[PDB]
Paper text:
The autosomal dominant monogenetic disease neurofibromatosis type 1 (NF1) affects approximately one in 3,000 individuals and is caused by mutations in the NF1 tumour suppressor gene, leading to dysfunction in the protein neurofibromin (Nf1). As a GTPase-activating protein (GAP), its primary function is suppression of the Ras signalling cascade by accelerating the GTP hydrolysis rate of Ras, which returns Ras to its inactive GDP bound form. The ubiquitous Nf1 isoform-2 splice variant Nf1-23a (2839aa) is, together with Nf1 isoform 1, which lacks the 23a insertion (2818aa), one of the two biologically relevant alternative Nf1 isoforms. Our high-resolution single particle cryo-electron microscopy (EM) structures reveal the domain organization and structural details of the full-length Nf1-23a isoform 2 dimer.
In the closed conformation, HEAT/ARM core domains shield the GTPase-activating protein-related domain (GRD) so that Ras binding is sterically inhibited. In the closed state, additional contacts between the last helix α63 of the GRD and the core bury another ~240 Å2 of surface. The linker between GRD and the Sec14-PH domain is in the closed conformation part of a Zn binding site, contributing a stabilising contact to the N-HEAT/ARM core. The closed conformation of native Nf1 is stabilized by a cysteine- and histidine-coordinated transition metal binding site between the N-HEAT/ARM domain and the GRD-Sec14-PH linker L2 and is formed by the triade C1032, H1558 and H1576, with the fourth coordination partner a solvent accessible water molecule. The tetrahedral site coordination is clear in map density and typical for Zn2+. In the closed protomer conformation, access to the hydrophobic core of the Sec14-PH domain that, in the X-ray models, harbours a phosphatidylethanolamine representing a membrane lipid component, is largely blocked by the GRD. In closed conformation, the GRD arginine finger R1276, critical for Ras binding, is not accessible. The 63-nucleotide exon 23a inserts 21 amino acids into the Nf1 GRD between residues Q1370 and V1371, extending helix α56 by one turn before it loops back into helix α57, with residues A1380 to R1396 remaining disordered at the lysine-rich loop apex. The well-defined linker L2 connecting the GRD with the Sec14-PH domain is unique to the cryo-EM model. No major conformational rearrangements in the Nf1-23a Sec14-PH domain core relative to the X-ray models were observed.
Numbering used by the authors:
A (entry chain F): 483 to 620, 674 to 795, 831 to 853, 887 to 1121, 1134 to 1379, 1398 to 1953
B (entry chain N): 1954 to 2458, 2601 to 2745
The structure:
């Protein structure tokens, strides 16, 4: 009994003796025997095994102090005087390896106490490393040092989720000592600090948060899980801490569930931790995939004991905490689980579990989409959320009616509203076909006056359900053209009008019930929404729904009438066609906007840009970067922006280079600059060299390897070394020579950095060029060389043996910039000789670019392009953040009144322009700056475009088909402009089809002929979709364009080119562009009997009578030759026109069926108005009736050909009814509601300018005018003057005036008499 | 259509008949609501085209409206009827409704009243205002000839009256600008028309809705007009009426002036600006407690020339306002005639002769106002001081002399009056100028408005850059002259804190090599104590206590004159403070006191009263809630009178 107790007392005393003096027991070392361990090692192992005992807490406490005295600098030498810097690391490292594995193994009572001692040991061993490195670097890193460095990290992560607050706070602090050791081992930051410890930058943040006030575990976990979400680079420590704690989590779950609060709180912490850091372990059956399924099988956890709390928390975490790198996997699993609810034949099955699982799937999606977090945007694009949403409504659709199921419907309606605020972030395969269906399904649930029939006030919630539904429908309809499902063939035009009438009546019926005479806030809000819904419906599609809406002019609600005219006013100001109407009206209207943004703040302050930077949320930093760079370049002030933006970042953080490579608003500016302009420069330069190494037989097969371990005996080392050096010279010489070809933009970019560092040096033999040269080369030139295939330079991935040479080439080249010889790199030391000569040469290349004038007074390019597309986004951005940007301006600028300073100017102008218009829909898939030919090909290949059955349709349409060969023998392709509709099909599938056909042959030179016969605005490419063609293709194929032939061009095409000139400037004066002025030329250059132009085009054949020397009377007269074809009329101009610097003759073609109007005003000249062409076409011929006779003959023949011409019309546009609108304006300009009159005056202003009406006074459109009530003589002088000057409107005006007489009241009836008489 | 002859029938009592006929027609319009659109076109539309008959017809409208009242149905309808009448002769009805407005206002002098709403003729103005509102649209008020007279009346109505009449004045302005853009008599170039359209937008921003006093109103038009104006009379309520601030009228009066100048560039030999000036100048120098304050803030904002004779009147209208305040119990009435005098002077100084003595004598008027302890006067007082220094620089008066030399030189002739003022206020300017001009500027930190706190900081910066430049000492050197301005900027300016750092963490404040005078180092400690007695902020107390702990050791002998100021607050901090950062400096103070306390005190607490500065700590206190004249202003009245006599003999 006491004998055992005696030993403990003796053992405790001995340990304290070592604490007092460690040299007493360290004298006369035994030294490590070849077959036995030494004496100092055996002593340490004895003390270590007492720390985690917990059977003898007093001894364990002392053992910590004893081992902490043997680590002081004084006592380190005594371990082994023979070699003090080799035995230490071996002994000390194994101590960490033993102890760390114990903490991870399981929880211990003193777990929070061993950690405080373990921190000190790290501090001590850092000190001994510092001095040893100082004295002699020679410091060794045996496998144990690596095998124990890992396990140290694996034991600092799994402590982050420990429940005790003190443990986690200490653990975060211990990351400093893990980083500070990195600097000692390698002074140079980039080489090792970001290579030995890849996630070095994030670790530094742990320290800052730890130095913060203590708070409950819930508050702390939020910051901890945030930091764990930014671990970008996988590492052995990360990839093993996730799995080690995954096993504990899985088994812990079984105990909680199987058993029929502290236990739960531990479970919650492990889950939150285990998700935020999931992204590292990413990359079929896998540990990560098994985590999700087990997670989803808990959202429906029905457990009487603790079921409620589990579901309440899994919803909270998966929503607000998941790592943005796991969204693409969450959706896929989520969609499949839903898909198995609809059995074959599409009948929903209600099991009361799926009901619970959909009610959760709605809450998870809402939180996930609602939160804007860093990096989320890049990942949302990959997945397609369409198919899941549609299936989701169907299940809720059949759920039935009850107090419970109504609440589910409510939230589902709220989700769709949040899902339409991120529509730009998400990706849609078919937006139109999807957004229409949701409108179809949702309108069903809107039922008014159903709570009175139900006779239960408990179901007042139905008022909320109707209130919620409209809010969703309003967001959906913003910019949505209607499209009917092609269940039957009833003609497209007639189907849409029928569809429009279906919705308009629905809203109108709902509108009458909301009348107050027939809760006031409820009706006030609901009525307000139901009117905004109609406004969005009309704007998108006026042609098919303007007639159905005219009845709103005389509505019974004066408020409703007021709104209708406001929306009606906007339509007139917009242009029915392109009309160069934004080129004039929008260009001038938004001209001032850039001047405000480009406000040259004194001494380069630029308050608008600088202020806009900080205030804008980080999510849109992508959009903000592109807009600023593009805009300032147009103004020739790019240098100014860079100096201001970089200076704050560089001066703020002396580590200038490091931050720029890091993620931030300033950083992203560089990325855009290099990528947008660099791409062309790199590919043009590197490409010729790549052919030589990859394909030339002279190079044949050789290994660019000098690794003795991998060195193959077959090849001589000398041969490889000399060849690799010779190849490097080829690349190096090319880079230095091509100094001129450097784009101006980067030249300016380098200068600003040069001035920044040079100014940075002044305040602080470092060479500014040295840092610049290494920086530019490392981030711009180096990446392309290593992997040209990914950059898109090379179609096919280089063979691995060729790949190795490029990799080694980069290292040699990079060393030249730093003027660093090969240290501990004997592998490449023989090459060190070569770099010596080229050190001076590299300097010259850097200086030339860095020698550009700080102010480019001499270097000038006054391009001053309009940049129409960019401006719209800029105005859109300002409107959203109008308030918040003001607050930033408000804080400063007190020295001078802001009346002449940004905030005053911003508010005035921004209000003046009014709200921005809604964005149009997107035909193409979601795409971002990070796009290249390799990326596009992989994405489409992974998609199953082959069997879509819409890809197949392109084959039938015969668009871009290969046709035989040419005189030179090159294959020919024919692209048909007619066959492509603007939006009816996704625009990416067209590119994939074209790319697929050209892939086999585009390597060799090829000739392409494009047929633009009968081109119209219907078949067109938008600005955004057009840009992809320049980038999607690999790029080397562009050079293989042997020749281009254009046939049957028309004026409309020329007009398009003028508007999109900037993008097509590259093709300006293009040698490859050859224009077929007449049919008799193409057959000569092309192989006759091989050309396969469209049969329909040839069917016209231009084989009818020619009325030579007909003159097109217009603003300018151009001789036009008219051919009256059998089925159409072709107008061929006889005067050459300049298109892209090449002369050509335009040949407009008018199909006979399209000839609605044929008026022969006189034998000298005839009138030919055509559908939606505005002013008719007038020409002069000596015998007009001879021509018109045939045209009437042609049209009359078609009338017989067509099945039913009598059914037509029932379609109108604002230009068609000048009279009708004039009536409602005048009638409502005397109403009794003050607001209504103000709207009427504005409508009159926007109606007297579009149609160039002549009135006596001048009218200006504004808001807020206070008009007098007695407007009984003003509208009796406007009416009189118009009738005198514009009599032709009599028939239109008089008919409508009568129709409003009946609807108006007694008091207004007398007014109609007053201004009606002058017209008779 | 035949009453032309009868209206001037030799006053044979037949003229009395036509007015009965006209009065009968007016009653038909009020009752026959359904036939309204047809009566206006026939009866009034045609009857208003007889020039000779306009004068009598228009007169009858005013009488009918008068009886009903401001919101009565009868008066409301005649306003609409006037629109049709004016279509025939815009040039005659417009120039006759305006002529009555300008004459009613000019008769308010006979029986002055504290406010317009309390004047007897208030109703006559109110109804006449609605006529101008309706006639504003579509240029039925001839702007091309009456623009001067319309702005003149706009300024006297902004933000006065019931919420209906306040929304009307906003509508009136929005229509006058609109008529300018769409008038054919004037030929505005395409450059000018851009200016007008931007101004048209500004007045509809929520910034100006506050200035006119109709904030919390979504739209002005809706309130201005009432739909059921024929059936029932207006029903005003919520008699609570916001206040009006003479600084707001500056923004309005300067926004309008911008529009007028733009037009004057095109119209050759225009007379608008000279007609507007005369109207303002007539009310400026005439006693009317209801219009004089508003007519002075407008005279200064627009005038282009000022003479000695005019300046004497402005400074002697300030003399009488002070006298009235103390004599009678009506204070707020006459506390706005002073705040308006200072704002006027703030605008007219840079137009002076450039060599008059008054360019320098307006530095003691600014000082004499800060001594009255009122938030509104104090805010207006600094605005004069800030610009007075700015003006003198452009005239290069500080080239070879120091502020003390300049301002103290023009104070010698009337020193006898000044000396007594310094005795009571508890500050002296002869003993130490650079510290007396800083007690007055230490109260600014206690102002509620965060926009005046910035102004005082800027004022200190400019004074600092002027004393050093006289010595050519880098603008931040520490000397006897430039030490008061560094203690004041210590807690707000980073450059002063960094460039002058505490030794016991360039040069360090509290240097004993240069600060070797007991008097110049006794003041420097009360300034630091003063800033902490009233300040309440962790960052401010931290920095100021660290500089006091070091003061205990560097200046052991003079430190005990700062006990009573620190006595009360320190005692509480020791008991309850729980801040390691803020508790360290306090302990260092306690230890130093006991160590130094071993000999008779060289200087008692009353050492400052010996040479004048006994009231420095009181003058930096918070603004009194019980707003009252300090009652020693009886000397400021005598001081000002001597100033006029000495430099403006006549
Ligand atoms: C890059 C092409 C841009 C224009 C594309 C227009 C859209 C139709 C193109 C034809 C459809 C079939 C696929 C064609 C793929 C190959 C295009 C090609 O050869 O591109 C090169 C040559 O381009 C051409 O020859 C295109 C000539 C097209 C016809 C002339 C333009 C006006 C008429 C067509 C307008 C668009 C269609 C009708 C709607 C307005 C570009 O040379 P680069 O040096 O600029 O390369 C980029 C390096 N950074
Ligand atoms: Zn797709």
């Amino acid at each position: 009994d006491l004998e055992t107790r005696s030993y403990k007392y003796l053992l405790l005393s001995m340990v304290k003796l070592i604490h007092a003096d460690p040299k007493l027991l360290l004298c006369n070392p035994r030294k490590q025997g070849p077959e036995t361990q030494g004496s100092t090692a055996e002593l340490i192992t004895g003390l270590v095994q007492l720390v985690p005992q917990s059977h003898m807490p007093e001894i364990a406490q002392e053992a910590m102090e004893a081992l902490l005295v043997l680590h002081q600098l004084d006592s380190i030498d005594l371990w082994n005087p023979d070699a003090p810097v080799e035995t230490f690391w071996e002994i000390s490292s194994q101590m960490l390896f033993y102890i760390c594995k114990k903490l991870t193994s399981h929880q211990m009572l003193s777990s929070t106490e061993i950690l405080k001692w373990l921190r000190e040991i790290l501090i001590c061993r850092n000190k001994f490393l510092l001095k040893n490195k100082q004295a002699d670097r020679s410091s060794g890193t045996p496998p144990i040092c690596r095998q124990a460095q890992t396990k140290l990290e694996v034991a600092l992560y799994m402590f982050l989720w420990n429940p005790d607050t003190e443990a986690v706070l200490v653990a975060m602090s211990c990351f400093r000592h893990l980083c500070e050791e990195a600097d000692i081992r390698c002074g140079v930051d980039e080489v090792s600090v970001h290579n030995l410890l890849p996630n070095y930058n994030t670790f530094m943040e742990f320290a800052s948060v730890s130095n913060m006030m203590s708070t409950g575990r819930a508050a702390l976990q939020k910051r901890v899980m945030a930091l764990l979400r930014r671990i970008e680079h996988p590492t052995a420590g990360n990839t093993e801490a996730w799995e080690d704690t995954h096993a504990k989590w899985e088994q812990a779950t079984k105990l909680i569930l199987n058993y029929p609060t502290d236990s739960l709180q531990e479970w919650i912490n492990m889950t939150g931790f285990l998700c935020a850091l999931g992204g590292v372990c990413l990359q079929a059956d896998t540990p990560v995939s098994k985590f999700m399924d087990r997670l989803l099988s808990l959202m429906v956890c029905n457990h009487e004991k603790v079921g409620l709390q589990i579901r309440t928390n899994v919803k909270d975490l998966v929503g607000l905490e998941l790592s943005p790198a796991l969204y693409p996997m969450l959706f896929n699993k989520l969609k499949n689980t839903i898909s198995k609810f609809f059995d074959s034949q599409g009948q929903v099955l209600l099991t009361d579990t799926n009901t619970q699982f959909v009610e959760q799937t709605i809450a998870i999606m809402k939180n996930l989409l609602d939160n804007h977090t860093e990096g989320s945007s890049e990942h949302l694009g990959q997945a397609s959320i369409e198919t899941m949403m549609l299936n989701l409504v169907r299940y809720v659709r059949v759920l039935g009616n009850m107090v419970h199921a109504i609440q589910i419907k409510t939230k589902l309606c709220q989700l769709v509203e949040v899902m339409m605020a991120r529509r730009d972030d998400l990706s849609f395969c078919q937006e139109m076909k999807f957004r229409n269906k949701m409108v179809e399904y949702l309108t069903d649930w809107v039922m008014g006056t159903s709570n009175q029939a139900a006779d239960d006030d408990v179901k007042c919630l139905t008022r909320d359900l109707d209130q919620a539904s409209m809010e969703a429908v309003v967001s959906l309809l913003a910019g949505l053209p209607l499209q009917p499902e092609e269940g039957d063939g009833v003609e497209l035009m007639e189907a849409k009008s029928q569809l429009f009438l279906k919705y308009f009546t629905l809203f109108m019926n709902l509108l009458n019930d909301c009348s107050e005479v027939e809760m006031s806030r409820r009706l006030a809000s609901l009525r307000h929404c139901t009117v905004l819904a109609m406004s969005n419906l009309l704007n998108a599609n006026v042609d098919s729904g303007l007639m159905h809406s005219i009845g709103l002019g005389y509505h019974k609600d004066l408020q409703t009438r007021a709104t209708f005219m406001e929306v009606l006013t906007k339509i007139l100001q917009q242009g029915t066609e392109f009309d160069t109407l934004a080129e004039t009206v929008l260009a001038d209207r938004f001209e001032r906007l850039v001047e405000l943004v480009t406000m040259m703040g004194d001494q380069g302050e630029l308050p608008i840009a600088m202020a806009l930077a900080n205030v804008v949320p980080c999510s849109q930093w992508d959009e903000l970067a592109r807009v600023l760079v593009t805009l300032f370049d147009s103004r020739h002030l790019l240098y100014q922006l860079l100096w201001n933006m970089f200076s704050k970042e560089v001066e703020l953080a002396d580590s200038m280079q490091t931050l720029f490579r890091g993620n931030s608003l300033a950083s992203k500016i560089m990325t855009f600059c290099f990528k947008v302009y660099g791409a062309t420069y790199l590919q043009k330069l590197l490409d010729p060299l790549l052919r030589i190494v990859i394909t030339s037989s002279d190079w044949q097969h050789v290994s660019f390897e000098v690794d003795p371990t991998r060195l193959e005996p077959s090849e001589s080392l000398e041969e490889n070394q000399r060849n690799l050096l010779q190849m490097t010279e080829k690349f190096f010489h090319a880079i230095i020579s091509s100094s001129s070809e450097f784009p101006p933009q980067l030249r300016s970019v380098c200068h600003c950095l040069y001035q920044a560092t040079c100014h940075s040096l002044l305040n602080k033999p470092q060479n500014s060029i040295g840092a610049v040269g290494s920086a530019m080369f490392l981030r711009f030139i180096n990446p392309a060389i290593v992997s040209p295939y990914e950059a898109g330079i090379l179609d096919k991935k280089p063979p691995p043996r060729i790949e190795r040479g490029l990799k080694l080439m980069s290292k040699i080249l990079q060393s030249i910039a730093n003027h660093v010889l090969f240290t501990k790199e004997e592998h490449m030391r023989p090459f060190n000789d070569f770099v010596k000569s080229n050190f001076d040469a590299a300097r010259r290349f850097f200086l030339d670019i860095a020698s550009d004038c700080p102010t480019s007074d001499a270097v000038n390019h006054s391009l001053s392009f309009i940049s129409d597309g960019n401006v719209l986004a800029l105005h859109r951005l300002l409107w959203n953040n109008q308030e918040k940007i003001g607050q930033y301006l408000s804080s400063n600028r007190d020295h001078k009144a802001v009346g002449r300073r940004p905030f005053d100017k911003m508010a005035t102008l921004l209000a003046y322009l009014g709200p921005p218009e809604h964005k149009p829909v997107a035909d193409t898939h979601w795409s971002s700056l990070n796009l290249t030919s390799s990326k596009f090909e992989e994405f489409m290949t992974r998609h199953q475009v082959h069997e879509k059955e819409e890809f197949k349709a392109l084959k039938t349409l015969s668009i871009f088909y290969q046709a035989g060969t040419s005189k030179a023998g090159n294959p020919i392709f024919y692209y048909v402009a007619r066959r492509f509709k603007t939006g009816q099909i996704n625009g990416d599938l067209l590119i994939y089809h074209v790319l697929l056909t050209l892939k086999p042959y585009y390597a060799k030179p090829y000739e392409i002929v494009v047929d633009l016969t009968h081109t119209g605005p219907s078949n067109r490419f938008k600005t955004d979709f057009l840009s992809k063609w320049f980038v999607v293709f690999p790029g080397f194929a562009y050079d293989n364009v042997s020749a281009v032939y254009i046939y049957n061009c028309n004026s409309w095409v020329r007009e398009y080119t003028k508007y999109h000139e900037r993008l097509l400037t590259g093709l300006k004066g293009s040698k490859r562009l050859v224009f077929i002025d007449c049919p008799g030329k193409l057959a000569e250059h092309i192989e006759h009997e091989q050309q396969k132009l469209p049969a329909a085009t040839l069917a016209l054949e231009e084989d009818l009578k020619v009325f030579h020397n007909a003159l097109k009377l217009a603003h300018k007269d151009t001789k036009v030759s008219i051919k009256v074809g059998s089925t159409a009329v072709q107008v061929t101009s006889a005067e050459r026109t300049k298109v892209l610097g090449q002369s050509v003759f335009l040949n407009d073609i008018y199909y006979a069926s399209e000839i609605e109007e044929i008026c022969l005003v006189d034998e000298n000249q005839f009138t030919l108005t055509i559908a939606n062409q505005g002013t008719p076409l007038t020409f002069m011929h000596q015998e007009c009736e001879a021509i018109v006779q045939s045209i009437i003959h042609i049209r009359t023949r078609w009338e017989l050909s067509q099945p039913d011409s009598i059914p037509q019309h029932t379609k109108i546009r604002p230009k068609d009814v000048p009279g009708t609108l004039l009536n409602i304006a005048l009638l409502n300009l005397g109403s009794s509601d003050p607001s209504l009159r103000s709207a009427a005056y504005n409508l009159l202003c926007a109606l007297t300018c579009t149609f160039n009406l002549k009135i006596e006074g001048q009218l200006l459109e504004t808001s807020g005018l206070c008009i007098p009530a007695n407007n009984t003589l003003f509208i009796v002088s406007i009416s009189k003057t118009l009738a005198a000057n514009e009599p032709h409107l009599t028939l239109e005006f008089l008919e409508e005036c009568i129709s409003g007489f009946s609807k108006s009241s007694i008091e207004l009836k007398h007014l109609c008499l007053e201004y009606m008489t002058p017209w008779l």
